[PDB]
């Protein structure tokens, strides 16, 4: 997992359940106090496990509860980290982009299995997104989007479409849906 993006986590789990649950799952990895992970760096899935197995262990909560809450709460942290991605834009924008997004920021990773992120207009108010990735990370999907329609300030509707598991790779597709219309049809 790209380091810096771990970085968001361990922030946004030290705004969750605090400091202490924090620096006691990273002692147990054996991570350096006050660590500074750089733009290249890459942090084992493994060791990103354990942690939350650590937070999970010492707050009583479900792993999938915490990386649910994870994905609501990291979203504000996004946006500090990496303003320039929420600049001047819309939520429906800010989802299309995503993909291209993941791709960009693995390109330099030995070995990149960045999660896939397509989103497809599908109506004039709604757009299907689908997650594939060996991770399997649906509950911090289905957070990201929900703290991105709190941040962006714009309601939306979420419904499963269909879920699957082939080869290693968990898909996850979901219908999302804008009170207001986002789209117009135009001549292709
Ligand atoms: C400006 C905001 C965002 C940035 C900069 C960003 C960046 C990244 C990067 C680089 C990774 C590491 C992937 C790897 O090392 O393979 C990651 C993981 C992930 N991102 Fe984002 N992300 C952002 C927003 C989102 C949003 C809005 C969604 C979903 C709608 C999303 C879904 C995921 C998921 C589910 C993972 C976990 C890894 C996996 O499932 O394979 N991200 N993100």
């Known amino acids: 997992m790209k380091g810096t993006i771990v970085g968001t986590w361990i922030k946004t789990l030290r705004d969750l359940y ?3 649950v924090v620096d006691e799952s990273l002692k147990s990895v054996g991570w350096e106090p006050d660590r500074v992970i750089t733009p290249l760096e890459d942090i084992d899935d493994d060791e990103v496990r354990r942690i939350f197995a650590k937070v999970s262990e010492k707050t009583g909560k479900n792993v999938n509860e915490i990386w649910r809450e994870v994905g609501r709460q990291n979203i504000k942290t996004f946006s500090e980290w990496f303003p320039s991605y929420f600049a001047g ?35 004039k108010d709604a757009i299907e997104m689908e997650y594939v990735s060996k991770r399997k ?3 911090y999907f289905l957070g990201l989007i929900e703290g991105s329609s709190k941040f962006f300030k714009e309601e939306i ?4 479409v269909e879920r699957g598991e082939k080869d290693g790779f968990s898909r996850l597709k979901v219908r999302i849906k804008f009170k207001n219309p986002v789209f117009e049809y135009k001549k292709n």
């Open 18 to 20: 605090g400091n202490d």
């Open 89 to 123: 834009r819309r939520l429906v924008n800010f989802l299309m982009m995503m993909d291209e997004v993941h791709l960009q920021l693995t390109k330099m990773i030995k070995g990149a299995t960045p999660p896939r992120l397509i989103a497809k207009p599908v109506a």
């Open 137 to 139: 990370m649906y509950d």
């Open 157 to 160: 509707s979420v419904e499963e």
